[PDB]
Scaffold this motif. Structure first.
Motif, PDB file in Angstrom:
ATOM      1  N   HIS A  14       0.772  -1.268   0.000  1.00  0.00           N
ATOM      2  CA  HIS A  14       0.000   0.000   0.000  1.00  0.00           C
ATOM      3  C   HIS A  14       0.796   1.308   0.000  1.00  0.00           C
ATOM      4  O   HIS A  14       1.925   1.368   0.497  1.00  0.00           O
ATOM      5  CB  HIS A  14      -0.977   0.016   1.193  1.00  0.00           C
ATOM      6  N   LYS A  15       0.189   2.360  -0.553  1.00  0.00           N
ATOM      7  CA  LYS A  15       0.829   3.677  -0.623  1.00  0.00           C
ATOM      8  C   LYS A  15      -0.206   4.794  -0.477  1.00  0.00           C
ATOM      9  O   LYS A  15      -0.547   5.217   0.636  1.00  0.00           O
ATOM     10  CB  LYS A  15       1.597   3.815  -1.957  1.00  0.00           C
ATOM     11  N   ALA A  16      -0.701   5.261  -1.612  1.00  0.00           N
ATOM     12  CA  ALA A  16      -1.685   6.329  -1.641  1.00  0.00           C
ATOM     13  C   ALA A  16      -1.963   6.676  -3.100  1.00  0.00           C
ATOM     14  O   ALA A  16      -1.121   7.294  -3.773  1.00  0.00           O
ATOM     15  CB  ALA A  16      -1.151   7.553  -0.893  1.00  0.00           C
ATOM     16  N   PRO A  17      -3.160   6.306  -3.602  1.00  0.00           N
ATOM     17  CA  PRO A  17      -4.230   5.597  -2.888  1.00  0.00           C
ATOM     18  C   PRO A  17      -4.694   4.238  -3.462  1.00  0.00           C
ATOM     19  O   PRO A  17      -5.155   3.367  -2.719  1.00  0.00           O
ATOM     20  CB  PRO A  17      -5.347   6.607  -2.942  1.00  0.00           C
ATOM     21  N   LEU A  18      -4.614   4.059  -4.774  1.00  0.00           N
ATOM     22  CA  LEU A  18      -5.048   2.793  -5.366  1.00  0.00           C
ATOM     23  C   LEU A  18      -3.873   1.944  -5.809  1.00  0.00           C
ATOM     24  O   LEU A  18      -2.806   1.976  -5.200  1.00  0.00           O
ATOM     25  CB  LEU A  18      -5.962   3.022  -6.581  1.00  0.00           C
ATOM     26  N   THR A  19      -4.081   1.182  -6.878  1.00  0.00           N
ATOM     27  CA  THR A  19      -3.035   0.331  -7.406  1.00  0.00           C
ATOM     28  C   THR A  19      -3.095   0.272  -8.907  1.00  0.00           C
ATOM     29  O   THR A  19      -4.095  -0.157  -9.484  1.00  0.00           O
ATOM     30  CB  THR A  19      -3.149  -1.121  -6.925  1.00  0.00           C
ATOM     31  N   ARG A  20      -2.017   0.710  -9.534  1.00  0.00           N
ATOM     32  CA  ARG A  20      -1.925   0.654 -10.968  1.00  0.00           C
ATOM     33  C   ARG A  20      -0.800  -0.319 -11.255  1.00  0.00           C
ATOM     34  O   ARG A  20       0.347  -0.082 -10.893  1.00  0.00           O
ATOM     35  CB  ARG A  20      -1.627   2.036 -11.553  1.00  0.00           C
ATOM     36  N   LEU A  21      -1.153  -1.428 -11.888  1.00  0.00           N
ATOM     37  CA  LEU A  21      -0.194  -2.460 -12.238  1.00  0.00           C
ATOM     38  C   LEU A  21      -0.584  -3.040 -13.612  1.00  0.00           C
ATOM     39  O   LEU A  21      -1.705  -2.839 -14.078  1.00  0.00           O
ATOM     40  CB  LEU A  21      -0.232  -3.542 -11.159  1.00  0.00           C
ATOM     41  N   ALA A  22       0.341  -3.740 -14.265  1.00  0.00           N
ATOM     42  CA  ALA A  22       0.074  -4.351 -15.569  1.00  0.00           C
ATOM     43  C   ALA A  22      -0.348  -5.810 -15.360  1.00  0.00           C
ATOM     44  O   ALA A  22       0.049  -6.444 -14.375  1.00  0.00           O
ATOM     45  CB  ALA A  22       1.325  -4.280 -16.443  1.00  0.00           C
ATOM     46  N   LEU A  23      -1.150  -6.345 -16.275  1.00  0.00           N
ATOM     47  CA  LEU A  23      -1.605  -7.728 -16.145  1.00  0.00           C
ATOM     48  C   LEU A  23      -1.622  -8.559 -17.409  1.00  0.00           C
ATOM     49  O   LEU A  23      -2.409  -8.312 -18.329  1.00  0.00           O
ATOM     50  CB  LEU A  23      -2.992  -7.782 -15.517  1.00  0.00           C
ATOM     51  N   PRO A  24      -0.768  -9.591 -17.454  1.00  0.00           N
ATOM     52  CA  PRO A  24      -0.755 -10.415 -18.655  1.00  0.00           C
ATOM     53  C   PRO A  24      -2.085 -11.144 -18.776  1.00  0.00           C
ATOM     54  O   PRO A  24      -2.827 -11.255 -17.791  1.00  0.00           O
ATOM     55  CB  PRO A  24       0.405 -11.369 -18.390  1.00  0.00           C
ATOM     56  N   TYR A  25      -2.395 -11.586 -19.996  1.00  0.00           N
ATOM     57  CA  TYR A  25      -3.585 -12.391 -20.274  1.00  0.00           C
ATOM     58  C   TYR A  25      -3.020 -13.816 -20.018  1.00  0.00           C
ATOM     59  O   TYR A  25      -2.154 -14.285 -20.765  1.00  0.00           O
ATOM     60  CB  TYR A  25      -4.026 -12.233 -21.745  1.00  0.00           C
ATOM     61  N   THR A  26      -3.487 -14.501 -18.973  1.00  0.00           N
ATOM     62  CA  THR A  26      -2.931 -15.816 -18.655  1.00  0.00           C
ATOM     63  C   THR A  26      -3.850 -17.034 -18.781  1.00  0.00           C
ATOM     64  O   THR A  26      -3.867 -17.898 -17.901  1.00  0.00           O
ATOM     65  CB  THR A  26      -2.275 -15.777 -17.226  1.00  0.00           C
ATOM     66  N   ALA A  27      -4.591 -17.130 -19.880  1.00  0.00           N
ATOM     67  CA  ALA A  27      -5.472 -18.284 -20.062  1.00  0.00           C
ATOM     68  C   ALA A  27      -4.742 -19.435 -20.761  1.00  0.00           C
ATOM     69  O   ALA A  27      -3.894 -19.201 -21.615  1.00  0.00           O
ATOM     70  CB  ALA A  27      -6.695 -17.882 -20.854  1.00  0.00           C
TER      71      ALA A  27
END
Lengths: 184, 46, 210, 220, 220, 184, 46
Positions: free
Chosen positions: F108-121
């Motif tokens: 946690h930091k301030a305020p949300l979370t921005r991250l990248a996400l691979p398509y893992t199907a």
């Protein structure tokens, strides 16, 4: 420099005439694009505020100069000291359109909002006066809303009007209007 | 366009800052300004 | 009795002449914005047939007549001929009022009217009336001219302007200097106005009166 | 690791002129066309210079009628933008927004009366240090010029840029009643059946003209 | 030391469109194969244009039956996306998401009746400024066209892009009941034992068509 | 432009036909990859939330457009205004798998979370509709959990569906649906 | 891919932002769109 006057062809005159020389002026400042790029803080009337211009005080620099050239084009750079999340919405888009986070729904920080704004009119050009208090519903640069907006400023950008208008000011009374400047 | 003295490409791409002015197919006020004679309709003396 | 200057201007079949000429002046433009736009999708044509002169009356410049009387005349405006029928059978179009303004007294009077041809508007501040000197305009004085003339371009807010409910062009002549009959001067000057709509093309079309 | 950084205090706190630009968050917008659009312009000293305006006056009318007495002085006032007659004109309807200036301004004259109304006028220009005349005789000692109605009507005289500092202000105070720039003053020689005529004077920017230092401050 | 930095206020506060990208924290992922996979596409005005749809209608049915009286008008309505018949169609089932547009849209016609049912129809297109006709006679004065059933059935007429501004909105108000874009109106000439037949009209995007300015706002 | 109709070969028509010209449209906006990259704020149902898509409101832009093309592929960019530490877990990974800090356990930091996400199907492709309310358990882009999640947004990325579906909207009533836009 | 107007390599390596599309061995809707005739099944007149 005499001439015919009921012809109104531009017929100026200058120093040299009776004597003296003429100088190399650096009007950089009276440059229309230059002196219109500098934010105007108009009253952000509540929350649902329309990016109009005739809302601004028709007495401020960017306001006045604005109200002096009939036609015009330019972009936008806003500011929003405020509450919640500014969710702007394009031109024409349904009043209601401004609410869904998917729309450009900015997320608060500290303290206002500095963002860029395209000029999005369906018309090839806009105006402060449409002969068609009574001016068109497509004359809006998008529309903002958050959940309490306290500061509304519009830095007009890449400015460029067309055609002119009347420029007058502070009607004095003693042929010379007196008002305290900046003294030592 | 007013006050843009950034030394970089203002980071964010061209087709992003402002909206691109599609073509079709002082402009004029400078045209009727740069043409005002300071001559004399008679002939200078002395 | 001078450098000598005359001139006749043909528009279609109609041709105004004059002798107290003074010249003219085109303002803002001299051209016209590419009237082969997208909104008209090739569906626009040239009808330079109704391109010509028609008469309408301005006020009557009288001695009393204050320093402001500037009888307005919107352009477009009621047309009992061609151009008018055109606006009734059409929605979208655009032109350019020629305008060759006369005001007959004689070479003995005093005073001057201020002729101007300005676009989109609503109404003007008196304090502003001191700057018609900003839009296409002429200056009348019986000691040099009897005619004015100033030929206006197309401004509109769009390429192809609609006039059923909109009139971009307005014509005003504020009395800058009051009139003086004088010793042997003429008695009164009725300001007459001669106009003509030019480089105009249409696009669009409705059913019929039936 | 990563490039260290000094989160420097005081650099970046919003400025109503800030040189840099903000962030764009829509992008890829192709607008309509702005081709050869009528009467554009991009400088206000371009239209100022390019299209003069008449001057407000005693009463309000722009013109002026031939005195038929010894009182000849047709005009006279503070040579500065505060000038009431100018304060409304186009050049004055803006110099408001610029603290200083330099350059030259012009005064265009015109007649309107009959041809049986041959007349003569004068244009004196005195500076700071003395009060303006009231006798073209005493005035013929400033930098002036004489003219008389003819075939061609108009005539535009350029008034000189004289001041200690290459500049000086557009505003004024009840300290400057001695004006740092002079009291230009127009008079009236003699005439003929040319009394009560109209000699309207207008104003444009001469070529020498210049304007700088943007100042916005409540004006209607 | 280290490179100073101006922790600039207002730049970086999350934008639902922010140009930049976020940080990746897994990486080195080799996916399956997406080779020549069936019926792809990447533009919605591609399938809009590429695969038309019929129109909802009075009642609901798409088709229309030959009037057998003077009342000929087979159709008529607001020439805009709000158009109920369109409001569901593919092109309309999306223009929702885009504030403005320009271009051309198409109206494809079809017959379904017997061969003993030879018939004739009409397609008028009037604009803003007057109310649509009800008599092909009065209508033959707009930009129209006439056709009659044959060997080939279908037929697609492109309706013109006419408006002051090169654009205008997809939405509408009880201010625009005068519509900024017209009231297209289809009629019916004469026919033969061809009463009560089916003349279904569909809609695709013409080539001139274009759509811009993304707007999302509650739609089911 | 007549033609045979019971053949359904694409047979369009255009301006020129009876007159007029045809223009140069700039559909950049109706670009499928372009108008699907812009976050959708779906309800982050508690804490243990599955990165599904048919959870999103089937009425939002990225939602709707989503529900219009049967097949598809793309990556992910999320957002999580929340509490604790977001510990995401891949696809197939045991519900329980999401808990161990070693896993991608963001702090946690301030305020949300921005991250990248691979398509893992495990499938070469996914879909909003599997004919096989009733759609596959491998249809999830990983799965998040923190200790209280308040904002769930999914900026789909490098989008690209296949095959089409039906697009309809706001059933009017007066042949013209009226709704307040943005006025001056 | 939507709204990526970054002037840099978005810092973090290629094999990191998105997951690499291994090969094997409007695609089609544009194929059946760019082929619609505006001709006439008879012959134009006037």
């Amino acid at each position: 420099t005499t001439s015919a006057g009921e012809s109104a062809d531009p017929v100026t005159a200058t120093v040299e005439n009776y004597g003296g020389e003429t100088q190399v002026q650096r009007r950089q400042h009276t440059d229309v694009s230059f002196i219109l790029d500098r934010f105007v803080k108009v009253t952000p009337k509540d929350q649902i505020n329309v990016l109009d211009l005739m809302q601004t005080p028709a007495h401020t620099l960017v306001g006045a100069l604005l109200r002096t050239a009939t036609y015009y084009f330019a972009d936008l750079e806003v500011a929003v000291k405020h509450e919640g999340n500014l969710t702007w919405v394009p031109n024409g888009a349904p009043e209601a359109a401004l609410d869904n986070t998917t729309n450009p729904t900015a997320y608060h920080k500290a303290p206002l909002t500095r963002l860029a704004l395209p000029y999005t009119a369906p018309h090839r050009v806009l105006a402060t006066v449409y002969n068609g208090r009574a001016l068109p519903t497509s004359f809006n640069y998008g529309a903002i809303k958050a959940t309490r907006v306290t500061e509304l400023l519009y830095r007009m950008k890449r400015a460029e009007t067309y055609c002119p208008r009347p420029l007058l000011a502070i009607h004095p009374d003693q042929a010379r209007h007196k008002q305290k400047i900046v003294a030592p | 366009s007013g006050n843009t003295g950034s030394i970089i490409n203002n980071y964010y791409m061209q087709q992003y800052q402002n909206s691109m002015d599609t073509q079709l197919g002082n402009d004029w006020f400078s045209k009727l300004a740069s043409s005002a004679f300071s001559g004399l309709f008679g002939a200078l003396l002395a | 009795l001078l450098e000598d200057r005359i001139l006749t201007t043909r528009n279609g079949h109609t041709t105004s002449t004059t002798q107290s000429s003074v010249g003219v002046t085109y303002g803002y433009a001299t051209a016209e914005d590419f009237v082969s736009g997208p909104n008209t999708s090739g569906l626009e044509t040239r009808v330079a047939q109704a391109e010509r002169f028609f008469k309408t009356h301005l006020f009557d410049w009288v001695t009393s007549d204050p320093f402001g009387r500037c009888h307005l005349l919107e352009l477009p405006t009621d047309h009992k001929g061609v151009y008018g029928y055109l606006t009734d059978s059409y929605a979208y179009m655009r032109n350019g009022w020629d305008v060759e303004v006369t005001a007959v007294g004689n070479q003995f009077n005093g005073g001057c009217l201020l002729v101007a041809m300005v676009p989109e508007l609503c109404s003007i501040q008196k304090r502003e009336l001191y700057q018609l000197t900003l839009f296409p305009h002429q200056f009348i004085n019986p000691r040099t001219n009897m005619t004015a003339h100033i030929t206006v371009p197309f401004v509109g807010v769009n390429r192809y302007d609609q006039y059923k409910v909109h009139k971009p062009w307005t014509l005003v002549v504020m009395v800058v200097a009051p009139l003086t009959v004088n010793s042997e001067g003429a008695p009164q000057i009725k300001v007459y106005a001669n106009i003509a709509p030019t480089n105009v093309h249409v696009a669009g079309e409705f059913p019929s009166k039936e | 690791g990563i490039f260290p950084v000094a989160c420097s205090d005081g650099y970046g706190g919003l400025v109503t002129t800030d040189p840099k630009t903000a962030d764009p968050a829509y992008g890829k917008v192709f607008n309509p066309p702005r081709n050869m659009l009528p009467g554009r312009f991009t400088n206000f000293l371009d239209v100022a210079e390019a299209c003069p305006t008449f001057l407000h006056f005693e009463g309000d009318v722009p013109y002026v009628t031939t005195k038929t007495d010894s009182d000849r002085v047709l005009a006279q006032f503070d040579l500065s933008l505060a000038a009431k007659h100018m304060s409304n004109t186009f050049l004055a309807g803006l110099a408001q927004y610029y603290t200083q200036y330099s350059g030259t301004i012009n005064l265009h004259f015109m007649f309107t009366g009959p041809t049986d109304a041959k007349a003569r006028y004068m244009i004196a220009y005195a500076p700071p240090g003395m009060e303006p005349p009231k006798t073209p005789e005493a005035a013929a000692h400033c930098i002036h010029a004489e003219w008389d109605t003819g075939l061609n009507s108009k005539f535009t005289f350029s008034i000189p840029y004289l001041s200690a500092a290459d500049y000086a202000y557009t505003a004024s105070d009840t300290a400057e009643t001695t004006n740092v720039q002079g009291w230009v003053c127009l008079f009236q020689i003699t005439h003929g059946k040319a009394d009560g005529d109209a000699l309207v004077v207008l104003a444009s920017a001469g070529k020498d003209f210049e304007l700088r230092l943007p100042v916005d401050a409540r004006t209607q």
